[PDB]
Amino acid sequence: MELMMAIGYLGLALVLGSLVAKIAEKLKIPDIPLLLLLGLIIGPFLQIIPSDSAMEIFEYAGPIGLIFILLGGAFTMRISLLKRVIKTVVRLDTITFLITLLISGFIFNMVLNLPYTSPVGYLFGAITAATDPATLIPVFSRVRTNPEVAITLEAESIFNDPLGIVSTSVILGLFGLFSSSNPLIDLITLAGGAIVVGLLLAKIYEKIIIHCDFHEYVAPLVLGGAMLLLYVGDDLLPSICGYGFSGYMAVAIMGLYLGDALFRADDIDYKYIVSFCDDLSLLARVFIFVFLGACIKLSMLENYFIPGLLVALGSIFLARPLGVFLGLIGSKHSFKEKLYFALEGPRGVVPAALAVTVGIEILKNADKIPASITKYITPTDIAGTIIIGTFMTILLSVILEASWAGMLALKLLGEYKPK
Amino acid sequence: MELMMAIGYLGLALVLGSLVAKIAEKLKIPDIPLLLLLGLIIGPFLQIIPSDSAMEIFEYAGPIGLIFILLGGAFTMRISLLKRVIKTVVRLDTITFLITLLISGFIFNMVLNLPYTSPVGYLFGAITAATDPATLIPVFSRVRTNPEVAITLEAESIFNDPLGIVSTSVILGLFGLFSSSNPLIDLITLAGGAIVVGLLLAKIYEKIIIHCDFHEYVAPLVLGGAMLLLYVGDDLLPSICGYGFSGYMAVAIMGLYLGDALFRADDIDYKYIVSFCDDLSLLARVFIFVFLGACIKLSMLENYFIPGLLVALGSIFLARPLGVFLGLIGSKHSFKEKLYFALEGPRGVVPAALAVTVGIEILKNADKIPASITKYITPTDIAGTIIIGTFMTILLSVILEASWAGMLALKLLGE
Ligand SMILES: [K+]
């Protein structure tokens, strides 16, 4: 709880992290795995930053950083250009999503000898189901590939960033909460509520920004505006209704529609936000990945190294492609194209943040409220397996992408038959 | 369950503060007073945010944002321009600062019937004596002033913020029961150390940043380095070598040397830093002023409104003038210019932040306060009077200086 300690660790993380990411850019290497390696170094390996401390810091700086990425990911692109391929986008972002998390659940259960009905694995998949846009952002921009593919991937990524949280949020209820009577109910409540309220405040902010020239004063407006969405979203509203919506998805929706409203209409206030959030997103990017590599326990790491790695392989090579094929069985896309989408989309920062947040929320709450069937496995090793599994998933997917990009892009974008 | 609610209140402060700031910017009036009024509105008046909870959040986010503000002015300041008026600046942050402090504290003690040696008054002065550049900078250029007084007042207003904090921490040591070391020792310790380590990290960062184009990645690098300096100075190092170390002044120094070096080396990485800090420094500047108005309790107002008022005027019309004149007693400037320096020294962000910090530091860690200075005045009354006093001081100084700025510049700085 030592604030100065937290500031110190965050400081070292930001310094060494920024340096590392800079080196990564200087060598065209993805920053992510290097950040993770650093996290492991200063984490268990050197014991500069202990686990519990990192957990307590992340308990505070978690949602804050998470609110940044959603914003930055919502302003990086707009939805006025999706009208061409929005169908493929939606199907790939919903059906492929659910299927992927399901199969990944099967794998996660079948690996750790957990029952195939274990909510643990399904939680893991729900976390890892979302992909990372900024990861594939340089690797498509430098290519400037067939715009369909590019914007399809961007749309899928940005749109799956919130749902993953929502999916994770719903499944967590099974592990013990104030209600969680039925997952579908809270899914509708969260999604629909976030859509409604988020779009409400989106319209409000739209009209309130257009009529003036806030300029530099836009930053405190949206950020705090997003901050309000969390209180009203997760803490406050249940106190008066029990139900509610995911504040994060509400933030994503609000910021997205707001960006597109600041782009359909043309306000100069727009250009600040993007440049603001992008710089703001970069902090949370560096901050989360390093702390993910610190929350690992050396013993737990050695215990679940091999299985998690194998789980990751199941996700990348089996889950993702299968979900792609099954989600796009009625598409106008080539087999080589579907295969492209399959071996493309990697995971990133959202599954990391969600992983650690799940770990701490379980350890802090499920210690008091452990589901019986689940309690047969120590919540300790639940959080351990989820966190390390997500870790190796991120790592493996990212490096695999780093070796995939060029070769696959050339070898799979060849045909494009004209009708 | 405190976290999400803290996010809520803080976010509300950010939104409402933003809107208010825009309103003020439109009506050609400063944002600060309206922000304080807003804080009072959602504070005691509407009771949207309980004072205890406000102070509770400020315990966390307070020190955080304080790094932003200090980082803000740091990069805006460049050294190569000061060399012509630096002799004036040095005095404006040394002797003038000390005198303003001693006199403001003197009057503060005299008002509430406290002995002229009561550390409470001098604490108030320590908090108050720091002039703010964020209210001078948008105003100075608009009124087409001479360059030198603009550069001068900017330099003073910037250099004050660290020295205000340092002095605030030093005097705080006297409010420490279990130990009361030599003031001068702590002063030279914190200051000198800040200079040293500041220059060190600023040199490292100089080479690192100059060598390659960091672009956006300066933000975590610099902020992290800043974050790093506080933990060393205000936690680790004293737990190790025993002797203290100021983090804030070190941070400010670092921003100064680094910024000036990058500006001198024409490294475009400089701007990427400035854009980042300016926004952050704007974020907390809103967050600070709002919470100050919320930390105040209704009782504090209905028991210390008028006393804090009288104290405020003393700081503005008696303290700072005498400080300026006596500081520049041998200067070769002009009487009109001296009066201009005197009548333009708004108390801004830093005095507010220090007022809240000290406020919670005293109110919470109350029982272990020395009884010598407690017998005269209740610690609750101490915190309340310092907070209110700083509040009235800031409001009055900003409003008066802003309303009189034009006429002041008109009939003074024409040599
Ligand atoms: K450079």
Numbering used by the authors:
A (entry chain B): 1 to 419
B (entry chain A): 1 to 415
Paper passage:
MjNhaP1 has 13 transmembrane helices (TMH), referred to as H1-13.
asymmetric unit were refined to 3.5 Å resolution. Detailed views of the MjNhaP1 x-ray structure. Glu154 in H6 interacts with Thr76 in the interface helix H3. Nevertheless, changing N160 to alanine renders MjNhaP1 inactive. closely resembles the x-ray structure of MjNhaP1 rather than that of EcNhaA. inward-open and the EM structure the outward-open state. inward-open with a sodium ion in the binding site.
